[PDB]
A = this chain, B = another copy of it.
Protein backbone atom coordinates (compact mmCIF):
# COMPACT_ATOMS: atom_id res chain seq x y z
CA UNK A 1 0.00 0.00 0.00
CA UNK A 2 3.05 2.26 0.29
CA UNK A 3 3.99 4.59 -2.57
CA UNK A 4 6.08 2.95 -5.36
CA UNK A 5 12.29 7.31 -14.11
CA UNK A 6 10.68 8.02 -17.48
CA UNK A 7 11.38 10.73 -20.02
CA UNK A 8 8.64 13.12 -21.10
CA UNK A 9 8.38 11.66 -24.61
CA UNK A 10 7.63 8.18 -23.25
CA UNK A 11 5.11 9.55 -20.73
CA UNK A 12 3.22 11.38 -23.47
CA UNK A 13 3.23 8.28 -25.73
CA UNK A 14 1.78 6.15 -22.93
CA UNK A 15 -0.73 8.84 -21.96
CA UNK A 16 -1.96 8.90 -25.57
CA UNK A 17 -2.16 5.10 -25.61
CA UNK A 18 -4.45 4.95 -22.58
CA UNK A 19 -7.63 5.93 -24.39
CA UNK A 20 -7.37 2.81 -26.60
CA UNK A 21 -7.58 0.77 -23.41
CA UNK A 22 -10.45 2.87 -22.01
CA UNK A 23 -12.28 2.34 -25.30
CA UNK A 24 -11.90 -1.43 -24.97
CA UNK A 25 -12.99 -1.70 -21.35
CA UNK A 26 -15.89 0.70 -21.85
CA UNK A 27 -17.09 -1.33 -24.85
CA UNK A 28 -20.26 -2.22 -22.92
CA UNK A 29 -21.26 1.47 -23.17
CA UNK A 30 -21.85 0.91 -26.89
CA UNK A 31 -24.00 -2.11 -26.05
CA UNK A 32 -26.04 -0.23 -23.46
CA UNK A 33 -26.52 3.02 -25.39
CA UNK A 34 -27.75 1.09 -28.42
CA UNK A 35 -30.10 -0.91 -26.17
CA UNK A 36 -31.47 2.34 -24.74
CA UNK A 37 -32.07 3.65 -28.25
CA UNK A 38 -34.11 0.53 -28.93
CA UNK A 39 -36.04 0.61 -25.63
CA UNK A 40 -36.98 4.21 -26.33
CA UNK A 41 -37.92 3.46 -29.97
CA UNK A 42 -35.81 6.45 -31.03
CA UNK A 43 -35.42 5.48 -34.69
CA UNK A 44 -39.15 4.80 -35.07
CA UNK A 45 -40.15 8.05 -33.38
CA UNK A 46 -37.81 10.01 -35.65
CA UNK A 47 -38.98 8.15 -38.77
CA UNK A 48 -42.61 8.80 -37.78
CA UNK A 49 -41.95 12.55 -37.47
CA UNK A 50 -41.20 12.44 -41.20
CA UNK A 51 -38.47 15.09 -41.23
CA UNK A 52 -35.81 16.27 -38.77
CA UNK A 53 -37.19 16.40 -35.23
CA UNK A 54 -36.16 19.08 -32.72
CA UNK A 55 -34.77 17.88 -29.38
CA UNK A 56 -37.72 19.20 -27.36
CA UNK A 57 -40.26 17.43 -29.58
CA UNK A 58 -38.18 14.26 -29.49
CA UNK A 59 -38.11 14.31 -25.68
CA UNK A 60 -41.87 14.92 -25.56
CA UNK A 61 -42.53 11.99 -27.90
CA UNK A 62 -40.23 9.76 -25.83
CA UNK A 63 -41.95 10.79 -22.57
CA UNK A 64 -38.65 12.20 -21.36
CA UNK A 65 -39.23 15.29 -19.20
CA UNK A 66 -37.71 18.51 -20.52
CA UNK A 67 -35.47 18.65 -17.43
CA UNK A 68 -33.87 15.44 -18.78
CA UNK A 69 -33.66 16.65 -22.39
CA UNK A 70 -29.96 17.58 -21.97
CA UNK A 71 -29.26 13.92 -21.17
CA UNK A 72 -31.21 12.81 -24.23
CA UNK A 73 -29.16 15.29 -26.27
CA UNK A 74 -25.97 13.60 -25.07
CA UNK A 75 -27.32 10.12 -25.78
CA UNK A 76 -28.23 11.32 -29.28
CA UNK A 77 -24.74 12.75 -29.84
CA UNK A 78 -23.34 9.29 -28.96
CA UNK A 79 -25.76 7.59 -31.38
CA UNK A 80 -24.91 10.08 -34.13
CA UNK A 81 -21.25 9.19 -33.74
CA UNK A 82 -22.12 5.47 -33.90
CA UNK A 83 -23.75 6.22 -37.26
CA UNK A 84 -27.48 5.81 -36.66
CA UNK A 85 -28.68 9.41 -36.71
CA UNK A 86 -27.65 12.86 -37.87
CA UNK A 87 -27.97 16.18 -36.09
CA UNK A 88 -28.16 19.78 -37.25
CA UNK A 89 -28.83 23.16 -35.60
CA UNK A 90 -31.41 25.36 -37.35
CA UNK A 91 -31.78 28.01 -34.62
CA UNK A 92 -29.11 30.74 -34.32
CA UNK A 93 -28.51 24.90 -28.50
CA UNK A 94 -31.43 22.95 -29.92
CA UNK A 95 -30.40 20.24 -32.37
CA UNK A 96 -32.81 18.51 -34.75
CA UNK A 97 -32.29 14.84 -35.52
CA UNK A 98 -32.75 12.71 -38.60
CA UNK A 99 -32.00 9.18 -39.85
CA UNK A 100 -28.66 8.00 -41.22
CA UNK A 101 -28.49 4.86 -43.40
CA UNK A 102 -27.48 2.55 -40.53
CA UNK A 103 -30.80 3.29 -38.78
CA UNK A 104 -32.53 1.17 -41.45
CA UNK A 105 -31.39 -1.74 -39.30
CA UNK A 106 -33.16 -0.32 -36.23
CA UNK A 107 -36.63 0.35 -37.64
CA UNK A 108 -39.46 -1.86 -36.36
CA UNK A 109 -41.22 -1.72 -39.74
CA UNK A 110 -38.28 -3.39 -41.50
CA UNK A 111 -38.43 -7.19 -41.38
CA UNK A 112 -34.61 -7.25 -41.32
CA UNK A 113 -34.22 -5.02 -38.28
CA UNK A 114 -31.73 -6.07 -35.62
CA UNK A 115 -33.81 -5.18 -32.55
CA UNK A 116 -34.45 -8.69 -31.23
CA UNK A 117 -30.88 -9.82 -31.81
CA UNK A 118 -29.67 -6.74 -29.94
CA UNK A 119 -31.93 -7.40 -26.94
CA UNK A 120 -30.90 -11.06 -26.96
CA UNK A 121 -27.19 -10.31 -27.17
CA UNK A 122 -27.03 -7.78 -24.34
CA UNK A 123 -29.35 -9.81 -22.11
CA UNK A 124 -28.18 -10.77 -18.60
CA UNK A 125 -28.19 -14.42 -19.72
CA UNK A 126 -25.36 -13.74 -22.20
CA UNK A 127 -23.46 -10.96 -20.42
CA UNK A 128 -23.35 -12.41 -16.89
CA UNK A 129 -21.42 -15.63 -17.67
CA UNK A 130 -18.41 -13.55 -18.69
CA UNK A 131 -17.84 -12.68 -15.03
CA UNK A 132 -17.12 -16.38 -14.52
CA UNK A 133 -15.14 -16.96 -17.73
CA UNK A 134 -11.74 -16.99 -16.01
CA UNK A 135 -13.03 -19.42 -13.38
CA UNK A 136 -14.47 -21.65 -16.11
CA UNK A 137 -11.17 -21.57 -18.06
CA UNK A 138 -9.44 -22.71 -14.87
CA UNK A 139 -11.84 -25.58 -14.23
CA UNK A 140 -10.57 -29.07 -14.98
CA UNK A 141 -12.73 -32.04 -15.94
CA UNK A 142 -17.53 -29.00 -11.61
CA UNK A 143 -16.84 -28.56 -15.32
CA UNK A 144 -19.42 -27.54 -17.93
CA UNK A 145 -19.26 -27.25 -21.75
CA UNK A 146 -19.03 -23.46 -21.62
CA UNK A 147 -19.10 -20.40 -19.37
CA UNK A 148 -22.83 -19.96 -20.00
CA UNK A 149 -23.59 -23.36 -18.46
CA UNK A 150 -21.03 -22.73 -15.71
CA UNK A 151 -23.05 -19.65 -14.70
CA UNK A 152 -26.48 -21.28 -15.21
CA UNK A 153 -26.21 -24.27 -12.85
CA UNK A 154 -25.04 -26.50 -15.68
CA UNK A 155 -27.80 -25.48 -18.08
CA UNK A 156 -26.89 -25.02 -21.74
CA UNK A 157 -28.56 -22.30 -23.80
CA UNK A 158 -31.20 -24.71 -25.18
CA UNK A 159 -32.46 -25.49 -21.69
CA UNK A 160 -32.48 -21.84 -20.60
CA UNK A 161 -34.48 -20.96 -23.74
CA UNK A 162 -37.05 -23.60 -22.76
CA UNK A 163 -37.37 -21.86 -19.38
CA UNK A 164 -37.27 -18.26 -20.61
CA UNK A 165 -39.87 -17.70 -23.34
CA UNK A 166 -38.95 -14.03 -23.78
CA UNK A 167 -35.25 -14.79 -24.26
CA UNK A 168 -36.10 -17.68 -26.58
CA UNK A 169 -38.33 -15.45 -28.72
CA UNK A 170 -35.63 -12.78 -29.02
CA UNK A 171 -33.11 -15.35 -30.25
CA UNK A 172 -35.55 -16.82 -32.79
CA UNK A 173 -36.59 -13.38 -34.02
CA UNK A 174 -32.95 -12.33 -34.33
CA UNK A 175 -32.11 -15.34 -36.48
CA UNK A 176 -35.16 -14.80 -38.69
CA UNK A 177 -34.23 -11.16 -39.25
CA UNK A 178 -30.73 -12.13 -40.31
CA UNK A 179 -32.06 -14.86 -42.63
CA UNK A 180 -34.27 -12.27 -44.33
CA UNK A 181 -31.22 -10.31 -45.50
CA UNK A 182 -28.75 -13.13 -45.83
CA UNK A 183 -30.98 -15.24 -48.07
CA UNK A 184 -31.53 -12.37 -50.49
CA UNK A 185 -27.77 -11.79 -50.75
CA UNK A 186 -27.19 -15.55 -51.02
CA UNK A 187 -29.48 -16.17 -54.01
CA UNK A 188 -27.98 -13.19 -55.85
CA UNK A 189 -24.27 -13.61 -55.09
CA UNK A 190 -24.41 -17.38 -55.51
CA UNK A 191 -27.02 -17.79 -58.23
CA UNK A 192 -24.75 -20.31 -59.98
CA UNK A 193 -24.82 -22.60 -56.93
CA UNK A 194 -28.59 -23.07 -57.26
CA UNK A 195 -28.72 -23.65 -61.02
CA UNK A 196 -29.58 -27.26 -61.85
CA UNK A 197 -31.00 -28.16 -58.41
CA UNK A 198 -34.49 -29.66 -58.01
CA UNK A 199 -34.50 -30.00 -54.22
CA UNK A 200 -32.81 -28.64 -51.12
CA UNK A 201 -32.99 -29.40 -47.41
CA UNK A 202 -32.56 -26.40 -45.10
CA UNK A 203 -31.23 -27.91 -41.87
CA UNK A 204 -32.11 -25.75 -38.87
CA UNK A 205 -34.30 -23.65 -41.14
CA UNK A 206 -36.80 -22.62 -38.46
CA UNK A 207 -39.74 -20.53 -39.69
CA UNK A 208 -38.43 -20.88 -43.23
CA UNK A 209 -37.12 -17.39 -44.10
CA UNK A 210 -34.14 -18.76 -46.01
CA UNK A 211 -36.07 -21.44 -47.89
CA UNK A 212 -38.88 -19.02 -48.76
CA UNK A 213 -36.43 -16.81 -50.61
CA UNK A 214 -34.70 -19.76 -52.30
CA UNK A 215 -38.06 -21.13 -53.49
CA UNK A 216 -39.26 -17.73 -54.74
CA UNK A 217 -36.00 -17.12 -56.60
CA UNK A 218 -35.56 -20.60 -58.07
CA UNK A 219 -39.04 -21.90 -58.88
CA UNK A 220 -37.93 -25.45 -59.65
CA UNK A 221 -36.35 -26.14 -56.26
CA UNK A 222 -38.47 -28.10 -53.79
CA UNK A 223 -37.30 -26.83 -50.40
CA UNK A 224 -37.70 -28.80 -47.18
CA UNK A 225 -36.98 -27.19 -43.81
CA UNK A 226 -35.66 -29.75 -41.34
CA UNK A 227 -35.58 -28.69 -37.71
CA UNK A 228 -36.45 -29.60 -34.11
CA UNK A 229 -40.20 -29.74 -33.29
CA UNK A 230 -44.68 -18.17 -34.72
CA UNK A 231 -46.33 -19.19 -38.03
CA UNK A 232 -44.02 -20.62 -40.69
CA UNK A 233 -43.49 -19.15 -44.16
CA UNK A 234 -45.79 -20.39 -46.90
CA UNK A 235 -44.84 -21.31 -50.47
CA UNK A 236 -46.00 -24.10 -52.82
CA UNK A 237 -42.46 -25.52 -53.07
CA UNK A 238 -41.72 -25.18 -49.37
CA UNK A 239 -42.46 -27.87 -46.79
CA UNK A 240 -41.43 -28.86 -43.28
CA UNK A 241 -40.14 -32.01 -41.61
CA UNK A 242 -39.24 -32.45 -37.93
CA UNK A 243 -36.14 -34.12 -36.51
CA UNK A 244 -32.84 -33.95 -34.65
CA UNK A 245 -29.96 -33.39 -37.09
CA UNK A 246 -27.58 -35.27 -34.78
CA UNK A 247 -29.69 -38.38 -34.09
CA UNK A 248 -32.25 -38.56 -36.90
CA UNK A 249 -31.79 -39.08 -40.64
CA UNK A 250 -31.59 -35.84 -42.62
CA UNK A 251 -34.10 -35.72 -45.52
CA UNK A 252 -32.68 -36.56 -48.95
CA UNK A 253 -32.20 -33.73 -51.47
CA UNK A 254 -29.93 -32.47 -54.27
CA UNK A 255 -28.36 -30.11 -51.73
CA UNK A 256 -28.10 -30.04 -47.97
CA UNK A 257 -27.94 -26.48 -46.63
CA UNK A 258 -26.51 -25.47 -43.24
CA UNK A 259 -26.98 -21.73 -42.64
CA UNK A 260 -25.25 -20.55 -39.43
CA UNK A 261 -25.63 -24.01 -37.93
CA UNK A 262 -22.28 -25.79 -38.00
CA UNK A 263 -20.60 -22.84 -36.25
CA UNK A 264 -22.64 -23.69 -33.14
CA UNK A 265 -20.99 -27.08 -32.66
CA UNK A 266 -17.56 -28.66 -32.12
CA UNK A 267 -15.67 -30.95 -34.51
CA UNK A 268 -16.80 -34.34 -33.17
CA UNK A 269 -20.57 -34.03 -33.69
CA UNK A 270 -20.11 -31.96 -36.86
CA UNK A 271 -17.83 -34.61 -38.38
CA UNK A 272 -20.24 -37.39 -37.48
CA UNK A 273 -23.08 -35.47 -39.10
CA UNK A 274 -21.02 -34.60 -42.19
CA UNK A 275 -20.18 -38.28 -42.69
CA UNK A 276 -23.88 -39.07 -42.59
CA UNK A 277 -24.44 -36.40 -45.24
CA UNK A 278 -21.62 -37.95 -47.28
CA UNK A 279 -23.32 -41.34 -47.19
CA UNK A 280 -26.69 -39.79 -48.08
CA UNK A 281 -25.47 -37.49 -50.88
CA UNK A 282 -24.09 -40.54 -52.71
CA UNK A 283 -25.22 -37.54 -55.99
CA UNK A 284 -25.74 -34.09 -54.44
CA UNK A 285 -23.71 -31.47 -52.55
CA UNK A 286 -23.31 -29.79 -49.18
CA UNK A 287 -24.01 -26.07 -48.95
CA UNK A 288 -22.53 -24.33 -45.91
CA UNK A 289 -23.47 -20.69 -45.43
CA UNK A 290 -21.28 -19.60 -42.59
CA UNK A 291 -18.00 -17.96 -41.61
CA UNK A 292 -14.61 -18.80 -43.06
CA UNK A 293 -12.62 -16.71 -40.58
CA UNK A 294 -9.53 -16.06 -42.65
CA UNK A 295 -11.27 -15.57 -45.99
CA UNK A 296 -10.09 -12.71 -48.22
CA UNK A 297 -13.59 -11.26 -48.41
CA UNK A 298 -13.67 -10.55 -44.66
CA UNK A 299 -9.99 -9.95 -43.88
CA UNK A 300 -10.05 -6.20 -43.30
CA UNK A 301 -9.34 -5.14 -39.71
CA UNK A 302 -12.92 -4.11 -38.90
CA UNK A 303 -14.36 -7.35 -40.26
CA UNK A 304 -11.77 -9.46 -38.46
CA UNK A 305 -12.48 -7.65 -35.21
CA UNK A 306 -16.17 -8.44 -35.44
CA UNK A 307 -15.47 -12.04 -36.48
CA UNK A 308 -13.29 -12.49 -33.39
CA UNK A 309 -15.95 -10.89 -31.18
CA UNK A 310 -18.39 -13.49 -32.56
CA UNK A 311 -15.86 -16.24 -31.91
CA UNK A 312 -15.75 -15.06 -28.29
CA UNK A 313 -19.54 -14.83 -28.05
CA UNK A 314 -19.85 -18.36 -29.46
CA UNK A 315 -17.14 -19.61 -27.11
CA UNK A 316 -19.12 -18.33 -24.14
CA UNK A 317 -22.63 -19.63 -24.90
CA UNK A 318 -22.51 -22.14 -27.75
CA UNK A 319 -20.21 -25.13 -28.31
CA UNK A 320 -18.65 -23.94 -31.55
CA UNK A 321 -16.43 -21.32 -33.13
CA UNK A 322 -15.61 -19.51 -36.36
CA UNK A 323 -13.48 -21.90 -38.37
CA UNK A 324 -10.66 -20.99 -40.74
CA UNK A 325 -10.55 -22.45 -44.25
CA UNK A 326 -7.87 -24.89 -43.09
CA UNK A 327 -10.16 -26.08 -40.27
CA UNK A 328 -13.11 -26.50 -42.65
CA UNK A 329 -11.01 -28.32 -45.24
CA UNK A 330 -9.77 -30.76 -42.60
CA UNK A 331 -13.35 -31.59 -41.57
CA UNK A 332 -14.39 -32.08 -45.21
CA UNK A 333 -11.45 -34.41 -45.89
CA UNK A 334 -12.07 -36.54 -42.81
CA UNK A 335 -15.77 -36.72 -43.70
CA UNK A 336 -14.93 -38.17 -47.11
CA UNK A 337 -15.68 -35.16 -49.30
CA UNK A 338 -13.41 -34.59 -52.31
CA UNK A 339 -13.66 -30.95 -53.36
CA UNK A 340 -15.11 -27.62 -52.30
CA UNK A 341 -15.71 -24.12 -53.64
CA UNK A 342 -16.07 -20.88 -51.67
CA UNK A 343 -18.18 -17.99 -52.96
CA UNK A 344 -18.32 -14.80 -50.85
CA UNK A 345 -21.79 -13.56 -49.89
CA UNK A 346 -21.43 -10.81 -47.28
CA UNK A 347 -22.04 -10.14 -43.60
CA UNK A 348 -18.69 -11.77 -42.71
CA UNK A 349 -19.93 -14.95 -44.39
CA UNK A 350 -19.56 -17.10 -47.47
CA UNK A 351 -21.09 -20.07 -49.24
CA UNK A 352 -19.08 -23.27 -49.24
CA UNK A 353 -20.19 -25.87 -51.77
CA UNK A 354 -18.78 -29.27 -50.77
CA UNK A 355 -18.73 -32.22 -53.18
CA UNK A 356 -18.66 -35.87 -52.06
B-contacting residues of A (Cβ < 8 Å)?
Answer: 1-4, 6, 8, 11-12, 14-36, 39-40, 62-65, 67-68, 71-72, 74-75, 77-78, 81-83, 93, 101-102, 104-106, 111-112, 114, 117-118, 121-122, 124, 127, 130-131, 133-134, 137-141, 178, 181-182, 184-185, 187-189, 207, 230-234, 302-306, 308-313, 315, 321, 326, 345-348
Contacts and interface: CB of A to CB of B under 8 A. Distances in A.
Given A133-B32, A141-B67, A310 B8 contact: no
Q: Give chain A's interface secondary structure class.
A: helix
Contacts of A26: 31, 121, 306, 309-310, 313
B16 A25 contact: no
A337 to B, nearest CB: 22
B181 A130 contact: no
Given A36-B133, A134-B40, A74 B321 contact: yes
A118 B20 CA distance: 12
A14 to B, nearest CB: 5
Nearest to A311: B74
A312 B15 contact: no
B138 A29 contact: no
Nearest to A1: B231
A137 B321 contact: no
A213 to B, nearest CB: 9
A25 B18 contact: no
Contact of A36 (B101, B104, B134, B321): B134
Given A18-B105, A188-B11, A312 B74 contact: yes
Contacts of A12: 184-185, 188-189, 346
Nearest to A83: B20
Q: How many copies, total? A: 2
B29 A30 contact: no
Given A29-B27, A34-B25, A65-B140, A234 B303 contact: no
Contacts of A234: 3
Nearest to A112: B14
B25 A27 contact: no
A114 B16 contact: no
A162 B263 CA distance: 46
A52 B312 CA distance: 24
The 7 A-B pairs with the shortest beta carbon distances in the complex, nearest first, are A27-B30, A27-B27, A8-B188, A11-B184, A32-B130, A28-B28, A15-B346
A120 B349 CA distance: 36
B35 A25 contact: yes
A229 B154 CA distance: 47
Contacts of A16: 346-347
A200 to B, nearest CB: 19
A28 B25 contact: no
The interface centre, meaning the residue of A78, A137, A207, A347 with most chain B CB atoms within 10 A of its CB, is A137
Nearest to A39: B134
Contacts of A304: 81
Contacts of A138: 62-65, 68
